């Protein structure tokens, strides 16, 4: 008969994903103090150890 072809586009982003490769900075020496943190949400600093 008549054949059919389809096309689908992927999504462009996920929560907590780095958008570009432009100048960025990541701090890896951080510890979760209380509760759980959602990937994609802002955080706050409770205290920074002096030594």
């Amino acid at each position: 008969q008549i054949n059919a072809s389809y096309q689908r586009d992927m999504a462009i982003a996920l929560p907590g994903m780095v958008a570009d490769t432009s100048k960025y900075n990541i701090d890896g020496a951080c510890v979760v103090n209380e509760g759980d943190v959602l990937v994609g949400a802002a955080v706050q600093v409770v205290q920074a150890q002096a030594v």
Binding site: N25, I26, D27, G28, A29, C30, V31
Partner: protein
């Protein structure tokens, strides 16, 4: 008893007026990290000297 209680060494030449010796040191630290980490601690070193007659 000075020359039999404390050690006696022979390194200086008869024509020397002064001498010098040196000491060294270091610093540094480490931390618990995760992947995609951009900041890391660093280390260094020092030095010092003293004289005589």
């Amino acid at each position: 008893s000075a020359l039999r209680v404390f050690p006696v060494t022979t390194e200086l030449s008869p024509t020397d007026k002064t001498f010098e010796y040196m000491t060294f040191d270091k610093v540094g630290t480490a931390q618990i990290i995760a992947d995609y980490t951009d900041d890391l601690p660093l280390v260094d070193a020092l030095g010092t000297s003293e004289f005589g007659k």
